[PDB]
Point group: D2
């Protein structure tokens, strides 16, 4: 094998096709593609970590999660590159781009799903692509990594309501008081439940990082296209601002008030 | 209409990952290289336009592109943190399946080396079996580097530059030249009279520095995975002594 | 000069300024995290004041270099939160009883920073009334045209028709949107080659605001992960107060112009 | 303004609590140059972080020696975050150009970083013991005390070797107990033990994670050493002839040698 052959560089390096004649489009493309590639790896690591939670093998899953942390670090910092795109540069390419939409990233949606941000409406963008629909549908129906953590807590003897241990996995993650009581006992007695303590903090980290990514995205988008006002709640910067209110692991955050 | 994945070629880029081993960690090894190569693509794109801005004496937009190149280098130097999470056993399990493919074979990396003036004709060899890469690398070899172009722009601004450095065999390593340093010194000693050149000088130093860091992270991560003169970590260690823009660094002591 | 390392850097003071009040191991982090940030803020003020003087005596190229320095500083300040993020709620709970009413609300350097960036607020002088020396720095800072005010004035000196009422005004009032100022910026961004320094300058400002939003957002996220929606030692609503200050725009016309482009 | 306490005539404020009169009045430029503030602040912030780093390393080492590894891992995680700040910091000082430095140089005198006792305590805790490095601190008996206690105390790595021995690994006794003033050097029995650990990570997860935390620590420290020489070289250049050549030599420091060797023998 050559380097290029083993790495698939014939494909990786022939997928940059600028629609406009503008110098700054290569940036626009490469920034998305690098992100998509890292997401592929994040998905691979998260799914393995979830399998470790499932099988009570937390130590290797912690390692996987740490790797996800360092991947997320790349992704948040990446915005530093796109931030060198200016409004005039983007408006030069704009007319050539068409309706495309990060909304159509099926990898990003599977990440949200794996993190418990379930939404069956988010299947629609993928309906024309039965292979993508399948991936996102199956993830919608699979218990989230947080669902698995709650299940693990109950398999460690914490009295969690059965309706959050087994439920319709296609529904959004909603605060449950028995789950906060369990995390409270963990954080009040860390040396008695060190692994759950550590687990809790790795979830908070993952949420923290993802929040940062959400914020850096909407900030960068705004600095390139603005806050297009009065254009719907469904898309644009208005939508991306609402995405800042997403809570992934609710009782891990609430517990801080109640400690 | 054109979809997100149609525009971004996700069909290609997202099915180009082909692990040879059963090891869970091979995906990392692959995606690390791929994301880096992608970024190198954009870096090339940006450096070539910056070089054109130097040769046309339009430095303002060139500076903006170089600033962008720096942000990409920041990404590339930090990436190493992700690979750092591969432990030797992990890479040990993949290794039997890799075959003696090497980073020597990255033509994009070699073009970056060349545009930066680190010219070396022996380096075309790994690319002989692929006419498209061989062309790109050969052309780059014969093309004056961004440094060469900066030197020539100092000549056109009226600095006395040795004729033999304005026009030269361009397949030749970049080499210390005393008149070039004297021009750079005049620039640094009087920054307000030569602001653009002062700023450009510093962009070069930044770039070389950021490249040194990448050099160092690479060899250190390689060592922490497979452990410690022809080829190997020893080769990577010698790479640390590469000097790209000799007289900008020399000028520090003579200032 | 045969004065030593420590003597030159004042390490006797720097390195005996740590005074943990609780028995908790994690309090040194709480202290050093603030201290390092405050030190970097001093440097930042130092650079922003100079960069502002550059703007106002029309020496933009040095001021650009200085703002690039502020930007490298902001980058440290924003990544710094990764350190504090290693603090857990029980760790913080253990030192909280010993802390009293001290809170970053009473940072005077932070206020100077907001002021120089045009987020003027007279109410913000009171937490400093007990130290007449800080009072005076902050009060003078309130009264001084911001770096953004100086950019607007610069634009007027370059021939852009800016309303006199924003070329000269009561400087203690916070920044408010002005249509003539957006028109000025729009012309610059539509004709970048014809106005490159202004174009570069506008982007410096946006970078600055961007970095500052990041810092504010990392702050409030870190605070929530440590104390949730508990009220702040400073007496404020805590996280909800901090989320509100995320809402403030420093340089309105530079953001608004992106939609009108 | 939002229920915030305004009045601090009686109460302990932020500045009281943090000793900010101490911190914020310790900057005394000697040249009239704009850029000296940077030179000073850069060092001071690194010294501050270095203090916290000692605080956490000492506590981490305590957990190593009481076989309480979990808390130690968390401390070591924090030290890694601190080290990231310290490696990235060089981005700021990189903005200083030779002419800016040259202007303040005449005013500095013989202030060596050799004279940072905190930095020497970190080298020492990490096993880079060198008695000749107490010299710079002889004029300051409390600094000298700190540094020489450190020289005499077993390094964090020594304590890990020691813990492996308490955990049943055959370690040469002449490495479990040792002249702690002596530089750390390669012991085959120690590599043997790490090799057992890495070939069987699931049997020895805690040591496996510990080993990698040492390697992380050393790697980040290497990065700091590289960014240091590089930033120094771009400000004052490389005199061939202490010096930039001293700093180049430092790149050859190895702290945890059998953890690096074991990659080749795995
Ligand atoms: C200047 C460049 C960019 C612009 C103008 C932009 C704009 C937008 C907008 C307006 C949305 C809201 C949905 C919509 O209205 O279609 C969105 C969503 C999204 N974008 Fe970006 N974006 C940019 C860069 C990127 C990059 C580099 C990525 C990397 C993959 C990305 C990934 C996503 C994802 C994954 C979503 C869905 C988020 C959610 O549903 O919460 N975008 N983008
Ligand atoms: C643990 C994983 C890695 C190992 C073990 C490794 C090993 C090596 C070694 C030993 C060399 C020296 C030449 C040779 O003998 O083949 C080399 C060169 C090179 N590697 Fe890596 N490497 C790794 C990761 C990476 C990554 C992620 C990249 C990113 C693209 C990369 C890019 C390169 C390049 C561009 C060269 C040529 C450098 C030059 O000529 O100065 N390597 N690699
Ligand atoms: C995990 C530790 C921290 C906690 C729990 C925390 C909490 C808070 C809270 C609740 C406030 C609101 C005012 C109040 O009610 O007191 C505040 C304000 C503030 N804090 Fe923090 N903080 C932390 C770390 C830091 C650090 C490291 C800095 C660096 C200097 C900092 C700087 C500030 C500033 C400047 C304000 C006033 C901001 C404004 O009024 O817009 N904080 N902090
Ligand atoms: C442009 C600024 C700097 C210059 C020119 C510089 C130069 C040097 C040089 C030449 C040495 C070798 C010993 C000697 O000959 O005195 C040294 C050592 C040292 N410096 Fe730097 N330095 C700079 C910035 C810094 C900063 C910001 C720090 C942060 C604290 C630092 C920390 C140290 C330490 C701890 C040593 C001893 C290293 C060892 O023994 O391995 N230096 N410095």
């Amino acid at each position: 094998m050559s380097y290029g052959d083993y790495l698939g560089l014939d494909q990786i390096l022939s997928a940059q096709h600028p629609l406009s004649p503008d110098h700054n489009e290569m940036l626009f493309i490469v920034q998305h593609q690098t992100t998509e590639l890292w997401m592929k790896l994040m998905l691979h690591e998260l799914r393995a970590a979830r399998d470790g939670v499932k099988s009570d093998q937390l130590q290797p899953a912690f390692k996987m999660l740490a790797r996800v942390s360092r991947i997320m670090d790349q992704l948040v910092q990446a915005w530093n590159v796109l931030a060198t795109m200016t409004p005039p540069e983007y408006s030069a390419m704009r007319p050539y781009l068409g309706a495309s939409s990060g909304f159509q990233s099926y990898q990003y949606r599977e990440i949200e799903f794996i993190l418990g941000n379930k939404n069956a409406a988010m299947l629609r963008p993928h309906a024309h692509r039965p292979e993508h629909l399948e991936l996102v549908e199956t993830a919608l129906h699979t218990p989230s990594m947080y669902d698995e953590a709650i299940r693990l807590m109950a398999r460690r003897g914490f009295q969690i309501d059965p309706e959050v241990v087994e439920r319709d996995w296609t529904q959004p993650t909603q605060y449950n008081a028995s789950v906060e009581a369990a995390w409270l006992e963990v954080y009040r007695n860390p040396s008695a439940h060190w692994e759950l303590y550590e687990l809790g903090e790795k979830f908070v980290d993952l949420e923290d990082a993802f929040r940062q990514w959400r914020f850096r995205h909407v900030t960068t988008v705004e600095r390139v296209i603005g806050f297009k006002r009065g254009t719907g709640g469904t898309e644009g910067v208005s939508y991306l601002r609402r995405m800042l209110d997403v809570v992934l692991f609710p009782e891990l955050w609430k517990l801080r008030t109640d400690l």
